[PDB]
Write a protein that binds this ligand. Structure first.
Ligand SMILES: *[C@@H]1O[C@H](CO[C@@H]2O[C@@H](C)[C@@H](O)[C@@H](O)[C@@H]2O)[C@@H](O[C@@H]2O[C@H](CO)[C@@H](O)[C@H](O)[C@H]2NC(C)=O)[C@H](O)[C@H]1NC(C)=O
Ligand SMILES: *[C@@H]1O[C@H](CO)[C@@H](O[C@@H]2O[C@H](CO)[C@@H](O)[C@H](O)[C@H]2NC(C)=O)[C@H](O)[C@H]1NC(C)=O
Ligand SMILES: *[C@@H]1O[C@H](CO)[C@@H](O[C@@H]2O[C@H](CO)[C@@H](O)[C@H](O)[C@H]2NC(C)=O)[C@H](O)[C@H]1NC(C)=O
Ligand code: NAG
Ligand code: NAG
Ligand code: NAG
Ligand code: NAG
Ligand code: NAG
Ligand code: NAG
Lengths: 644, 170, 114
């Protein structure tokens, strides 16, 4: 009907009768500044004709803290400014991406473009027919939205939140097969920028803790989860604000591992426990994004490595709770800056970088790899970094903390990647998978199995085993953590298809390991295959069955005459020095009773000369219960029995 | 009691004359007990000279000899505002004039005679009495000297003594 | 000249105004009350214009004050300095109306003189 025809006046007088003062609001100033249809929603949502009997009952349902616990202030600065020896770049629509120095992101970039890419989606929050409509006026914010749902089709719990550059909201709505529409809300951010409350509550009554910048509000009813009302929020506010950025990303990590320790990932009973972890995760994103706004320019290296910390927390939660969803961020600026910083890093020039520089490079590949953009110059570069890491591994047969973190960053890159187009690149990637299998020895199995059996002190940044990228399958033993199987499944799902896997009748439950040698693939399984030759283990008591089926990637057959399935024996080991005949071959060790022990791929001549050592999985002299098979590129299998 | 004029029983349909035009009395529709209750009022108590008049409609006399005026109204105190009773009062005058034909929009504030100053006793209600009536009809006017008064109901009637009873049971 | 006062600062919230509430663009004045006078209940009053008739509607002071708080907070930098004093008043007038505020000061029918 009428939109402006209802008011011909100019002011909106507000008379204070018993003080003699009056305020005014210009009607035009309210129409072309606040959206005209948004004012009518603000008026209808207010419910100004609501009887005071109801508003009192609303305050009698909420839970108010005793008093605010305001603390010294300013917490820990979630900041990383470009260093004093800076090189800043005021980037605009000029598209000067070819004029950026180096390949490690040691330069600066404006924060207004980074924040514009973090919060790049309008979300109509606090709308009607939602449990947030009772406490918050409807608002439209540009921010990132998080959401989790756990429960059956009868009863459920809805965890969903939003991370803005001024505040973060989380909700604990109760989805039951009846009507109980009372949710628990947690707030964090600038006190003067928090979403405006309804008429029956104020922030001074509900703020639990405050520092010089941020506050902590919790709008929860008196009949909410008992673990929420009897919770020390002042302690949570301190561990979030005064902790270093790395302490926060590791404390939240141990929380998710503790939730995974018990079978509470999909249990709606421990919903407030997840609700608190989701709140801490959303604060971690807020503090990082907030610290970016506190500077004119930011360093590309820090932001790309701070994103990787948050991206690891989001992907480690999605494995525990598959309904975990994050929407809203479109990193188009940093995605374009790293596109030029990576093009300078050749495959041969990537393995030359040290551990820290390789971390910076791989931290930038993740921005393009989360959809999958890995160029061939990096995939071949990862092949050399692992090859150098594997050749040096054969000296000590141990992996340090700095090496396991590298394999974790490589894991978060190859798992999030489309299969390579060039067939020559795919063959070099299968060599790395066969190399991680080589470092996945029997010593490493029990090492990571026992390490993943202690979820209290579990640190995946320091507990990542090379088996999670290997092609070995007998990792399951058959309250312990399950991320060992979840991280490995991420690599087995997004795995480049084995070339000879489509030539037989393979059943992927009776499979121990897959060895994709060049133009031949051995399959250690429990049942023989149908395509090509099969080698059977002659052990009497094996507690299992071992059949080494050798397939050709072209579904073809071999030229040598296969009469039976007996494995010949060559005795005299001579530590081959005559031009590496063990090259492109895999030596196999198996216990004559407890199945396999270890596989090792021999690529370099140094790896060869290192297999004949103590503290190695092969060629132990007195230990006769373990045999040593030689799976070679011949397509033939032979047993190595020299000293013994 | 034969009621000649009742304002509350009309239901907002009865409109009166407000002199002058800009300021003065205004018909206001308030809702009390889930039912609309109309009223004339004015609360211009911070200015100086204000002869705010409010003339009623034509009331046919018929047989009215002595009329009684009932006034249902509310008055707001003066010490509530920070004014210290500069031009704020708690009373208002009541006038009355006669006419044989409905003047309509004509209102001369010289033919009216001041009856009495209406003082409060907070629904302050007082009743007046004047007479006798001579012409075929009459008007009624309310004057505000600068008070904050909300006039809700006005009742005009004359009292009739019923038939006397004979002691022999007729 | 200045603030023009209203005859009845008090009113009573009827359970019919929710059905016949005037929209925002029809309210003439927003006359408030005091935490000491008008029985100390949080109550506001709106004025309208329905055919040359000044329609007065009783309105919850809590919800109406929080409404104006959101209107000024929506302005942000475009808000005037006098608008910030409007937000200043509503900030302490709400926290002063919320203190106490038991079922005694929630009975709005005290001022329902009918
Ligand atoms: C309440 O009103 C006072 C002033 O009232 C003034 O005096 C009355 C008689 C009436 O004429 C009003 O219209 C006047 O505005 C406000 O305060 C004063 O503000 C001036 C600056 O403008 C300052 O110098 C004085 O110290 C103030 N006086 C006091 C007592 O504080 C006051 O702000 C009003 N209250 C609110 C909440 O708005
Ligand atoms: C980065 O460069 C831009 C422009 O290249 C700067 O922005 C504007 O410059 C014009 C001058 O033509 C001024 O009128 C505007 O006020 C500037 N905008 C702002 C927001 O200041 C911008 O200031 C530069 N950034 C820094 C940190 O120096
Ligand atoms: C809730 O946690 C807080 C820590 O944030 C506990 O308090 C502190 O206690 C020390 C005494 O050892 C005081 O010096 C600090 O000032 C307290 N913290 C603050 C923020 O003031 C508090 O005791 C805990 N409460 C409960 C019930 O467990
Ligand atoms: C609105 O207020 C200003 C002063 O703040 C006043 O000059 C103006 O006349 C008012 N508008 C109307 C329509 O009276
Ligand atoms: C949600 O439902 C659970 C299970 O019925 C209950 O324990 C909890 O108190 C409910 N929370 C709220 C806020 O209603
Ligand atoms: C936060 O809590 C974790 C355990 O939950 C603890 O290891 C860490 O030291 C705490 N941080 C601070 C700053 O208290
Ligand atoms: C991100 O923004 C670019 C514009 O630079 C657009 O082309 C692209 O589709 C956006 N991505 C998403 C997921 O919306
Ligand atoms: C293949 O088998 C022959 C024996 O017929 C052996 O001499 C040769 O070394 C084997 N190939 C490799 C790569 O070891
Ligand atoms: C509760 O109501 C009584 C009225 O009987 C009042 O005197 C008292 O002040 C109220 N409580 C508070 C905390 O104001």
């Amino acid at each position: 009907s009428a939109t402006q025809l209802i008011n011909g006046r100019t002011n909106l007088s507000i008379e204070l009768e018993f003080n003699g003062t009056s305020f005014f609001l210009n009607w035009q100033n309210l129409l072309n500044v606040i959206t005209e249809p948004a004012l009518t929603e603000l008026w209808t949502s207010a419910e100004v004709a609501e009887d005071l009997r109801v508003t009192l009952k609303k305050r009698q349902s909420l839970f108010f803290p005793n008093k605010t616990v305001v603390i010294s202030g300013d917490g820990h600065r979630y900041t990383c400014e470009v260093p004093t020896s800076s090189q800043t770049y005021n980037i605009t629509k000029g598209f000067n991406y070819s004029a950026l120095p180096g390949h490690l992101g040691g330069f600066g970039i404006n924060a207004r473009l980074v924040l514009g890419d973090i919060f790049a989606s309008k979300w109509s929050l606090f709308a009607r027919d939602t449990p947030e409509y009772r406490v918050f006026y409807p608002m439209n914010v540009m921010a990132v939205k998080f959401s989790i749902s756990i429960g059956n089709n009868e009863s459920g719990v809805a965890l969903y939140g939003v991370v803005s550059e001024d505040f973060v909201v989380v909700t604990l709505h109760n989805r039951s097969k009846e009507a109980n529409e009372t949710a628990s809300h947690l707030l964090f951010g600038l006190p003067d920028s928090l979403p405006s409350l309804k008429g029956h509550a104020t922030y001074d009554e509900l703020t639990f803790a405050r520092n010089a910048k941020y506050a902590l509000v919790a709008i929860l009813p008196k009949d909410s989860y008992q673990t929420l009302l009897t919770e020390n929020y002042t302690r949570i506010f301190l561990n979030m604000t005064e902790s270093t950025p790395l302490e926060f990303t590791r404390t939240i990590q141990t929380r998710i591992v503790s939730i995974e320790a018990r079978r509470a990932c999909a249990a709606q009973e421990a919903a407030p426990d997840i609700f608190l972890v989701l709140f801490q995760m959303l604060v971690a994103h807020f503090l990082v994004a907030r610290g970016i706004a506190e500077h004119r320019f930011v360093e590309v290296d820090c932001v790309c490595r701070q994103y990787a910390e948050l991206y690891f927390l989001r992907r480690i939660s999605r494995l525990c709770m598959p309904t975990f969803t994050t929407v809203g961020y479109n990193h188009t600026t940093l995605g374009a800056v790293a596109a030029t910083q990576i093009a300078r890093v050749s495959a041969t020039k990537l393995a030359s970088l040290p551990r820290s520089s390789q971390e910076t490079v791989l931290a930038m590949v993740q921005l393009g790899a989360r959809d999958g953009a890995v160029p061939s110059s990096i995939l071949e570069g990862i092949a050399m970094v692992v090859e150098h890491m594997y050749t040096a591994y054969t000296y000590v047969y141990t992996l340090g903390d700095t090496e396991r973190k590298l394999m974790l960053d490589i894991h978060t890159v190859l798992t999030d990647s489309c299969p390579p187009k060039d067939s020559g690149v795919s063959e070099k990637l299968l060599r790395t998978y066969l190399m991680f299998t080589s470092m996945c020895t029997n010593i490493e199995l029990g090492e990571m199995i026992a390490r993943f059996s202690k979820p209290d002190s579990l640190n995946i940044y320091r507990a990542f085993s090379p088996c999670f990228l290997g092609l070995r399958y007998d990792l399951h033993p058959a309250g312990t953590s399950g991320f060992a199987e979840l991280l490995h499944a991420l690599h087995l799902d997004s795995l480049n298809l084995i070339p000879a896997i489509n030539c037989s009748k393979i059943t992927a439950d009776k499979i121990i390991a897959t060895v994709p040698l060049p133009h031949v693939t051995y399959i250690i399984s429990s049942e023989a295959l149908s395509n090509a030759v099969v080698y059977e283990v002659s052990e009497i008591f094996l507690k299992s069955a071992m059949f080494i089926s050798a397939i050709k990637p072209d579904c073809s057959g071999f030229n040598f005459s296969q009469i039976d399935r007996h494995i010949p024996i060559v005795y005299n080991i001579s530590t081959p020095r005559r031009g590496c005949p063990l090259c492109d071959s895999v030596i196999m060790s198996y216990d004559e009773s407890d199945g396999l022990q270890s596989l090792m791929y021999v690529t370099n001549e140094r790896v060869q000369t290192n297999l004949f050592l103590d503290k190695s999985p092969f060629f132990d002299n007195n230990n006769l219960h373990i045999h040593y098979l030689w799976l070679r590129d011949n397509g033939t299998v032979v047993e190595i029995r020299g000293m013994y | 009691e034969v009621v000649l004029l009742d304002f509350a029983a009309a239901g907002g349909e009865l409109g009166w004359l407000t002199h002058p035009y800009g300021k003065g009395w205004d018909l206001m529709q308030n809702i009390m007990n889930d039912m609309p209750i109309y009223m004339y009022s004015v609360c211009n108590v911070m200015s100086g000279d204000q002869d705010n008049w409010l003339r009623t409609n034509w009331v046919y006399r018929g047989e009215a000899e002595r009329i009684f005026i009932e006034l249902k109204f509310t008055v707001r105190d003066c010490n509530s505002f920070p004014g210290g009773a500069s031009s704020c009062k708690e009373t208002f005058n009541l006038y009355y004039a006669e006419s044989d034909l409905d003047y309509g929009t004509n209102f001369q504030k010289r033919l009216f005679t001041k009856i009495d100053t209406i003082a409060p006793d907070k629904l302050n209600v007082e009743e007046r009495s004047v007479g006798p009536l001579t012409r075929k009809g009459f008007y009624l006017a309310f004057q505000d000297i600068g008070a904050c008064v909300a006039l809700l109901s006005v009742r005009v009637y004359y009292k009739k003594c019923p038939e006397l009873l004979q002691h022999h049971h007729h | 000249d200045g603030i023009q006062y209203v005859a009845l600062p008090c009113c009573a919230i009827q359970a019919s105004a929710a059905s016949t509430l005037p929209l925002f663009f029809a309210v003439h004045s927003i006359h408030f009350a005091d935490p000491n006078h008008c029985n100390g209940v949080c109550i506001a009053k709106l004025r309208s214009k329905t055919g040359d008739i000044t329609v007065e509607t009783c309105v919850n002071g809590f919800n109406l004050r929080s409404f104006l708080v959101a209107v000024v907070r929506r302005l942000g930098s475009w808000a005037s300095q006098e608008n910030l004093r409007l937000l200043w008043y509503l900030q302490r007038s709400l926290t002063a109306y919320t203190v106490g505020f038991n079922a005694t000061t929630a009975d709005s029918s005290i001022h329902n003189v009918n």
